Amino acid sequence: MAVADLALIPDVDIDSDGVFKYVLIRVHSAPRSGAPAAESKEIVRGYKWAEYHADIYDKVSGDMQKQGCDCECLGGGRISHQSQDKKIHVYGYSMAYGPAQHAISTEKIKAKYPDYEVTWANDGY
């Protein structure tokens, strides 16, 4: 075993080719389940294999425990890789928890990825 740190965890990790569900998760460090660190950050996760937002959350909480971290979903929604018109967009909510703070997610995607623009809405489900 080795310690981990929140810098090692990718800040956004999405698989995108259409509409898919996504979740915004706060992650807390707990390196080797006992190192003197308890910092936190938010991360954006979204993969089209998930039937529901809970499947993403379950995977991610599993992986973080292998790293030396723990998780709490803040909310979620959907992302759409345009494949038709202009740019990545983010919308909807998760029935499981609530709407993500999509503004955090879009700024994170915009910082991490070289795509020119990212926007969000809360227009409907």
Curated annotation (Swiss-Prot):
Work out whether the entry's keyword set contains Disulfide bond: no
> Which EC class is this protein assigned?
hydrolase
Q: Which InterPro entries match?
A: Janus, Janus_sf
GO BP terms: namely: actin cytoskeleton organization; lamellipodium organization; negative regulation of T cell receptor signaling pathway; positive regulation of cell motility; positive regulation of insulin secretion involved in cellular response to glucose stimulus
This enzyme catalyses: N(pros)-phospho-L-histidyl-[protein] + H2O = L-histidyl-[protein] + phosphate; N(tele)-phospho-L-histidyl-[protein] + H2O = L-histidyl-[protein] + phosphate
Impact when changing residue 78 to A: Decreased affinity for substrate and reduced catalytic activity
GO molecular function per UniProt: actin filament binding; calcium channel inhibitor activity; enzyme inhibitor activity; protein histidine phosphatase activity; transmembrane transporter binding
Where does the record place the catalytic residues? Answer: 53
| GO CC, alphabetical | cytosol; extracellular exosome; leading edge of lamellipodium; nuclear body; nucleoplasm; plasma membrane
EC number assigned by the record? 3.9.1.3
Where is the PTM N-acetylalanine found along the chain? 2
Which UniProt key words apply to this protein?
Answer: Acetylation, Cytoplasm, Hydrolase, Protein phosphatase
What tissue specificity does the UniProt entry give? Expressed abundantly in heart and skeletal muscle.
Impact when changing residue 45 to A: Slightly decreased affinity for substrate, but no effect on catalytic activity
Name listed for the protein in its UniProt record: 14 kDa phosphohistidine phosphatase
